[PDB]
């Protein structure tokens, strides 16, 4: 009995609907659905956007955020070091108080 | 007799240590099952409010574990939020303008 | 009603494949009136207790467990 | 002889019937099996989400 | 993780509420201990100058 590929899913139950055949239909349909949705659940569609919810796009976004914050911390250490050697450097927090009353921030 | 009593104490101690280990294990299991009991009781006593609370807490836990913060986006896209927080917005706008940040 | 799950847009911990019941219920809780839900679950509990009818009685049920306690 | 064909859309002769008519299990066994790394679902009998 | 596991046990198990049996309240160790101690308690000087 060669393979026949089973045309449209409800092919069987359209001829003498029984309990077992209907259960079989339900099972195979929900199996296909589960597989496809799991594949799209974690990965996503062919177009890849960092503003995706799937699993890989979420973690890609987290990695990019981490890299940005690491280089930001590098520049912050650069600012601290440069101001330690008595070379005035700008900071991500601003200058503070400028030369007036309340004196000058941006010293050691 | 002093030495004999010391010997018997040193012999009796290990079983007591083992039973203390077992007691701490059972106490931890009791804590976990009490957690579960409280969960199921909350759900059974008021199901709709419990399910809403569960959804909100799961989403907030994910947000916190990702290292995220900020306002809810759906709340701040609407115009009520800005006619209810009038005083806060006024003060902030003045502070931002007078400093040259706006 | 409300936006429901969509209200938490950037963070949505739902899985259609692995946890199929919770997503559907998240959509459904908006429609129902909660007071009738409380009434119905209380009716269910009372009817179950009445069916099994025909101190901690629910914990210690068999005769032997009470004597052991 | 049998074959485990394991592909939905190809025509078959029989299917392994899932666990539909259960038997009594105790609560502590459910507690033991409910953990991750031991919990298995069968999507053929669960609802679609 | 624990809330995920609890809700999975609650909603994703295909066991009717009747077929869930009750578990024991006394392990056999405590039963043996209680019987032994019941036996031993069933078997059970005014300052002389």
């Amino acid at each position: 009995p060669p393979e026949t590929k089973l045309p449209y899913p409800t092919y069987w139950s359209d001829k003498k609907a029984d309990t077992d055949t209907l259960l079989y239909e339900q099972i195979i349909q929900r199996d296909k659905i589960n597989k496809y949705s799991l594949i799209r659940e974690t990965n996503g569609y062919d177009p890849f956007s960092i503003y995706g919810f799937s699993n890989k796009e979420y973690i890609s976004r987290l990695w990019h955020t981490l890299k940005y914050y690491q280089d930001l911390k590098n520049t912050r250490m650069k600012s601290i070091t440069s101001t330690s050697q008595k070379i005035p450097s700008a900071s991500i927090w601003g200058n503070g108080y400028s030369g007036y009353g309340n004196g000058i921030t941006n010293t050691t | 007799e002093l030495n004999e009593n010391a010997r018997e104490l040193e012999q009796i101690k290990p079983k007591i240590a083992l039973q203390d280990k077992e007691i701490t294990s059972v106490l931890s299991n009791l804590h976990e099952s009490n957690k579960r009991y409280r969960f199921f009781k909350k759900i059974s006593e008021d199901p709709v409010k419990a399910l809403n609370e569960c959804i909100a807490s799961t989403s907030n836990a994910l947000k916190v574990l990702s290292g995220d913060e900020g306002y809810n986006e759906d709340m701040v896209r609407r115009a009520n939020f800005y006619k209810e927080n009038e005083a806060m917005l006024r003060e902030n706008i003045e502070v931002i303008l007078s400093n040259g940040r706006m | 009603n409300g936006l429901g799950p969509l209200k938490y847009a950037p963070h949505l911990p739902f899985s259609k494949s692995e946890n199929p019941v919770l997503s559907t219920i998240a959509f459904l809780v908006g429609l129902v009136n909660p007071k009738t839900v409380q009434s119905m679950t209380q009716r269910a509990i009372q009817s179950a207790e009445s069916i099994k009818s025909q101190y901690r009685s629910h914990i210690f049920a068999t005769n032997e467990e009470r004597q052991m306690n | 002889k049998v074959v485990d064909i394991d592909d939905p859309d190809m025509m078959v002769d029989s299917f392994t019937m899932p666990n539909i008519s259960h038997s009594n299990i105790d609560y502590q066994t459910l507690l033991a099996n409910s953990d991750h790394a031991k919990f298995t679902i069968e999507p053929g009998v669960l609802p679609v989400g | 993780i624990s809330s995920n596991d609890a809700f999975n046990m609650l909603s994703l198990t295909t066991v009717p509420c009747d077929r869930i049996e009750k578990s024991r309240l006394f392990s056999e160790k405590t039963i043996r201990y209680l019987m032994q101690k019941q036996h031993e308690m069933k078997t059970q000087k005014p300052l002389t100058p």
Binding site: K35, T42, W63 | - | - | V2, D6, D13, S14, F15, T40, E42 | -
Partner: peptide, 28 residues
Amino acid sequence: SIVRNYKPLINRLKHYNGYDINYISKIG
């Protein structure tokens, strides 16, 4: 003759709520 049997799908849970929170928690 041989019978062709289709056996339904039994899976273990892959993610926790659509995500794996161990890696997310590390990076966070």
